[PDB]
Design an enzyme around this catalytic site. Structure first.
Site, mmCIF file in Angstrom:
data_model
loop_
_atom_site.group_PDB
_atom_site.id
_atom_site.type_symbol
_atom_site.label_atom_id
_atom_site.label_comp_id
_atom_site.label_asym_id
_atom_site.label_seq_id
_atom_site.Cartn_x
_atom_site.Cartn_y
_atom_site.Cartn_z
ATOM 1 C CB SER A 200 -0.993 -0.004 1.176
ATOM 2 O OG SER A 200 -2.057 0.932 0.997
ATOM 3 C CD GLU A 331 -4.406 -4.306 -5.245
ATOM 4 O OE1 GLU A 331 -4.675 -4.236 -4.031
ATOM 5 O OE2 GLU A 331 -3.268 -4.608 -5.650
ATOM 6 C CG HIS A 444 -5.147 -2.781 -0.684
ATOM 7 N ND1 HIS A 444 -4.246 -2.685 -1.722
ATOM 8 C CD2 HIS A 444 -4.754 -1.868 0.240
ATOM 9 C CE1 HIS A 444 -3.353 -1.750 -1.444
ATOM 10 N NE2 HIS A 444 -3.639 -1.238 -0.260
HETATM 11 C C1 DME Z 1 -4.988 -2.777 3.839
HETATM 12 N N1 DME Z 1 -4.029 -1.974 4.640
HETATM 13 C C2 DME Z 1 -4.674 -1.647 5.934
HETATM 14 C C3 DME Z 1 -2.847 -2.803 4.910
HETATM 15 C C4 DME Z 1 -3.623 -0.734 3.917
HETATM 16 C C5 DME Z 1 -4.849 0.070 3.446
HETATM 17 C C6 DME Z 1 -4.977 1.535 3.885
HETATM 18 C C7 DME Z 1 -6.282 2.162 3.318
HETATM 19 C C8 DME Z 1 -7.524 1.902 4.173
HETATM 20 C C9 DME Z 1 -8.858 2.211 3.500
HETATM 21 C C10 DME Z 1 -9.999 2.619 4.404
HETATM 22 C C11 DME Z 1 -9.871 4.077 4.892
HETATM 23 C C12 DME Z 1 -11.054 4.440 5.815
HETATM 24 C C13 DME Z 1 -11.119 5.864 6.430
HETATM 25 N N2 DME Z 1 -12.138 5.981 7.523
HETATM 26 C C14 DME Z 1 -11.957 4.919 8.544
HETATM 27 C C15 DME Z 1 -12.011 7.284 8.202
HETATM 28 C C16 DME Z 1 -13.521 5.885 6.979
#
Ligand code: DME
Ligand code: DME
Ligand code: NAG
EC number: 3.1.1.7
Lengths: 540, 536
Positions: A200, A331, A444
């Protein structure tokens, strides 16, 4: 005590702990301060080298996670919790970890530096899936995983300012790199074969290091999993960075009243706010409702990044570079439940068409109407424009392609064409253990477990093939790590992994069934995103 | 003493036809019957006035003049090119029609089939060997009528709103012929209550126009549009454009609307034909100089408007298209294409050719097109590039406009039947790379493979029969399927829901869903928005 768990470092003595991996013992040096805690008047500031210490610094345990938002979407659910902090939060989190095989390797073993991902707003080396004991025990590699400043702390920036110039979460990583250089030697690591590897935003980071000159001299090889420095989410302009800093500041009462005009005072003011205060307004600075878009991330300052990563991969010289790149099956799936109406991990998310049309605007927030249309045109199956199942999977596709796959492909090609020796892959195996619904397939970040080798642990309920699989994967990585070619060294077992090339465009099927070379990474679709769509946008 | 079967009395007078021999028997044929007073001299550009009654017996045994038009000299002596050229003396006095009935004339009123020929509104004639009614007449017992209608400047030059050159007259010619049938067809054994129109290219466009024009709509009951539509990029022009051109052409030949048309009427017919192509505004292909203008009279609104807001419940329509609609045209204007070689082109030519094929496109629209039709895995392969350039022209000008029309008609009450013609005539003289080009289905529909003198195969003869059965069954009952004969492949109606059509080839019918679905959504739905966004 034991010369194996006692090590002198350029700053002082350390004491590791002896971990027990399935195949044997491993030396682990957890919590090594690589920098002076960026707290107080040090917040928003580039990191400083940790001052030397007296006596033997304990390093038998995991340090604090940097200050960050904690996920509350699905409380108690392993699929989300597994990504959340497992140590206490703190602005004093600048520590790194090191895993070495017990006993220390005879000669200079290649080093694998891991950079965690989490939208530049979350994450920690302290995590279970980033347990580098297997890749050291089994493949005998010296594995280093550091913590860097996320959120406002790591990326809030008022470009041009002296006290919050931005990208400090990267300088953090860079500082950890300069450390591994002048200090990994003592762990039996080779400061000459530094292979960076992250997923990521970590991947995006790795890319940043490649694009940033000063970071060049600190590594030799790079792996970029499910992420790039050139996407639509990994960077923001100066103007936007400012607009979000000031706004966040403003919301937090900085500065108070109708005073303003001095950035120093503005930061000074911000520096007094409790950490959780900032985290509270982290998400209110986004310009549109969206998904796969983050508030505080690297900024194109004209320093750490001399120009847009787009312009950089486009004209950089990557002749000597050896990169491994890849992507997972779906993804965009994970991100859907986080804000797109109709999606939940609890039902099959069989959405309506109108839901899909809306979703497109969220997943592609920067898109004008016409461009939205284009995307809808492209992703709709006109023989069945109402079929919920398509609409569902198509939404995941729009998000996944837009944010990860195409940018990956855009990088891979632009890299190879520039002189790089690129290798590509498509992780397609869905862990049996996986707690997310079947509809998300391979979300992802669900490749990590395998690359790290978690299936080797017997207690964990992984199938035997998954174990064998994991070993195969660890092999490719470590092979790419030492050689710069993920292929069975001399021992030409069987399927070969060919370099991704502009002409050929070769990538491999990373899954249970042996390698299976393919051509064109969503070639058709990504031509849309990478070639056309941009000019559609810069017209409207 | 006369053959009672070849002497026919018609509203204007009497006429004698001729007994013809078809492979399986005799056939009656009344050729060169005038349905209008010769549109010559001061009648030029003017609508057709009905044929004034005559005395005595008119000789309807031989084909009459072909309407004054341009002659295709691209490939001198080449069958595939000449087969469409005029086969009778050119003259402005060309308003005649032809009827073919079985011999002896049918006892019971039989369903009529009216043929409107192709040719981009700048050419054509019912005189042509491919439009021979004798097989259809003899084998299926049909009463086949076919008329000549003015083309080019003579039938379509418009100065919208004027009296002396209102435009769309060639369309009126066809209507007049349609009325003539209504009245007179009973005399030949035809049924005025079962008229079915059918055309190809501009012919099918013309058919569509009659569906979209109220007066014409009460002169027929069914229709077949083969590789052509009223809507689409080439079939019609704005009233302002029609005028731009007309005025230009007038100036090009040395010429107040009245005084202008007066001057144009003194110009030798060839002087006009010679200059009719100089008026096009851009370097294009599949775009013709003088076609039907949207005058808000024959065509109240645009065909696009009309097919989106019209009632078509009382209509049964058969629409289709051949497998390689674009090819034929590449040879005419896109550099890198010839009938002689294999026309493998470079990406540069493909690129410059898309601007030829979609002349109205903006650089962005073009790039949108290029992106769609490129194989990004081998964006350089000349084979794929060649094939692709052909699809751009076929899809843009024919296939998609057809799919659009099929959907709109179906959506608004009509009963639609769709097909895709996939067989390549064994006797075909065009390069194998052109596949099944524009127009090479006609000869099968008309039953030519039934003439043993022509070198078709046995399968091709059997095929021709099957198709004649399809067409006539439809022209007869509004359904192309074998009635009693619950045989094998049944041809289902095109519905917006299921989008099914069939494969017309040597093998049995095959049902297919979605006619270039994804590609046509690009042309029909998206491309126009992008087009208007980037317009002038
Ligand atoms: C997959 N990992 C974790 C390893 C990396 C992904 C990081 C992006 C997370 C997407 C969701 C964001 C949500 C934001 N809020 C919670 C504020 C809605
Ligand atoms: C087969 N029939 C006879 C039914 C249809 C014939 C259509 C004629 C195609 C000519 C294309 C001209 C394009 C423009 N320029 C002048 C550039 C070639
Ligand atoms: C799935 O559940 C969520 C919340 O429980 C809801 O918003 C959505 O409409 C549901 N979708 C389906 C297809 O059940």
């Amino acid at each position: 005590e034991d010369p194996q768990l006692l090590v002198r470092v350029r700053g002082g003595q350390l004491r590791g702990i002896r971990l027990k991996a399935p195949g044997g013992p491993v030396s682990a040096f957890l919590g090594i301060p690589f920098a002076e805690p960026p707290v107080g008047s040090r917040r928003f500031m580039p990191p400083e080298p940790k001052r030397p210490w007296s006596g033997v610094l304990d390093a038998t345990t995991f340090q604090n996670v940097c200050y960050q938002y904690v996920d509350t979407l699905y409380p108690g659910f392993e699929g989300t919790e597994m990504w959340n902090p497992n140590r206490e939060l703190s602005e004093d989190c600048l520590y790194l970890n090191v895993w070495t095989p017990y006993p220390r390797p005879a000669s200079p073993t290649p080093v694998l530096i891991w950079i965690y991902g989490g939208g530049f707003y979350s994450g920690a080396a302290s995590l279970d899936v980033y347990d580098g004991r297997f890749l050291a025990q089994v493949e005998g590699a010296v594995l280093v995983s550091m913590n860097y400043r996320v959120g406002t702390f790591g990326f809030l920036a008022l470009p041009g300012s002296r006290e919050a110039p931005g990208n400090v979460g990267l300088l953090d990583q860079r500082l950890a790199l300069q450390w591994v250089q002048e200090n990994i030697a003592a762990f039996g690591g080779d400061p000459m074969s530094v292979t960076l590897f992250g997923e990521s935003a970590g991947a995006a980071s790795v890319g940043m290091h490649i694009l940033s000159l000063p970071s060049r001299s600190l590594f030799h090889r790079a792996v970029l999993q499910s992420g790039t420095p050139n996407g639509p989410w990994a960077t923001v302009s100066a103007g936007e960075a400012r607009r979000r800093a000031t706004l966040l500041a403003r919301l937090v009462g900085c500065p108070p009243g109708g005073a303003g005009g001095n950035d120093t005072e503005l930061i000074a003011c911000l520096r007094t706010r409790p950490a959780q205060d900032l985290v509270d307004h982290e998400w209110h600075v986004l310009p549109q409702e969206s998904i796969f878009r983050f508030s505080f991330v690297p900024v194109v300052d004209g320093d750490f990044l001399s120009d847009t990563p787009e312009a950089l991969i486009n004209t950089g010289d990557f002749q000597d570079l050896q990169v491994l790149v890849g992507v997972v099956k779906d993804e965009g799936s994970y991100f859907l439940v986080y804000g797109v109406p109709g999606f939940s991990k609890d039902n099959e998310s069989l959405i309506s068409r109108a839901q899909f049309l809306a979703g497109v605007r969220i997943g592609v927030p920067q898109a004008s109407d016409l461009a939205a249309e284009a995307v809808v045109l492209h992703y709709t199956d006109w023989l069945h424009p109402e079929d919920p199942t398509h609409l569902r999977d198509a939404m995941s596709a729009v998000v996944g392609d837009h944010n990860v796959v195409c940018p990956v492909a855009q990088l891979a090609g632009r890299l190879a064409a520039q002189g790089a020796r690129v290798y590509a892959y498509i992780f397609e195996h869905r862990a049996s253990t996986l707690t997310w619904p079947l509809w998300m397939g391979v979300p992802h970040g669900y490749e990590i477990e395998f690359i790290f080798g978690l299936p080797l642990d017997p207690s964990l309920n992984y199938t035997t093939e998954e174990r064998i699989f994991a070993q195969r994967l660890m092999k490719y990585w470590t092979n790419f790590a030492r050689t710069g070619d993920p292929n069975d060294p001399r021992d030409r077992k069987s399927p070969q992994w060919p370099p991704y090339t502009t002409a050929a465009q070769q990538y491999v099927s990373l899954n249970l069934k042996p390698l299976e070379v393919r051509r064109g990474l969503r070639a058709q679709t990504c031509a849309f995103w990478n070639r056309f769509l941009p000019k559609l946008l810069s017209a409207t």
